[PDB]
């Protein structure tokens, strides 16, 4: 039952092909209602890059430009682009970075994994999962 993954392969830029659930996860983590359905209607391109230990990860919409980046394992501030400021720690785990994201008692997570070329992106907060589709530009 043999699997491996590496950091590197989510290297690229990708394309939103799908999303399940990503308006309910946003009204879990508190997103006003205009954030909320306006961030729906953007069709924003994920742009993943490393430099060895260290990740970045982009987020772009016609109108926005949010970015993190970050050695892996170690924890570090966060903008959110809905305005939340947590303390984020990303590693790469079971073939898949991981981003958990803690703020004010309630907390989050992200996890981004290739599979068959795409990129397969949940999230998860306190019970509503997210899933949203990238496709490799
Ligand atoms: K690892």
Known sequence: GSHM??????????????????????????????????????????????????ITVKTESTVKTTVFSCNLGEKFDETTADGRKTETVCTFQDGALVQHQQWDGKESTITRKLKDGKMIVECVMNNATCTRVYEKV
Request: proline share 2%.
């Open 5 to 54: 993954a590496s950091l590197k392969d989510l290297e690229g830029k990708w394309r939103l092909m799908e999303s399940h659930g990503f308006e309910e996860y946003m009204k879990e983590l508190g997103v006003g209602l205009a954030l909320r359905k306006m961030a729906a209607m953007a069709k924003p391109d994920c742009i993943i890059t490393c430099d060895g230990n260290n």
